[PDB]
A and B are shown apart, each in its own frame.
Chain A
Amino acid sequence: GGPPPAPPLPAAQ
């Protein structure tokens, strides 16, 4: 069908 929307990426260092 289709996949869910991606959540936000983990913040970076």
Chain B
Amino acid sequence: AGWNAYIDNLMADGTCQDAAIVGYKDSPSVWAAVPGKTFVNITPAEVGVLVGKDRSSFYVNGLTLGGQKCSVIRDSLLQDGEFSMDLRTKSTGGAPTFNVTVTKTDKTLVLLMGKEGVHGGLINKKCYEMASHLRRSQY
């Protein structure tokens, strides 16, 4: 506590370049995020895409996070037991892309972005563990 400490816990091991804790109920807003990166700028529109009823459109269209274009790999966000979505960013001109996981809790989304060459698997496991702790806390 408070939420910034969650961001430092998440960034501690050095695998990640970005993290965010985002409230998705009511009026959605970011509760903590690493400054000067991408997640710190997600919008309520971006959030509602993530958690909404339309779970197919984002395959052909992609979706965005803080303006960063990403492709959807796996969608289990609304599933009991998994509560996760895996994504890969899109880039232009041969610039590196990165893996992303969003995890959903009772009140929050947890968002993690890997550094270059970090496997989606490490990121998913990590974001999942943190979500799982939050669900266990009634969050």
Contacts and interface: CB of A to CB of B under 8 A. Distances in A.
Q: Interface residues of A: mostly helix, strand, loop or mixed?
A: loop
Interface stretch (B2-10, B35-43, B58-66, B117-125): B2-10
Interface residues of B, number: 16
Q: How large is the interface on A (under 10, 10 to 19, 20 to 34, 35 or more residues)?
A: under 10
Nearest to B130: A10
Interface stretch (B23-31, B68-76, B90-98): B23-31
Interface of A: 1, 3-10
17 contacts: A1-B27, A3-B3, A3-B23, A3-B29, A5-B1, A6-B1, A6-B2, A6-B3, A6-B5, A6-B6, A8-B1, A8-B137, A9-B5, A9-B6, A9-B9, A9-B133, A10-B133
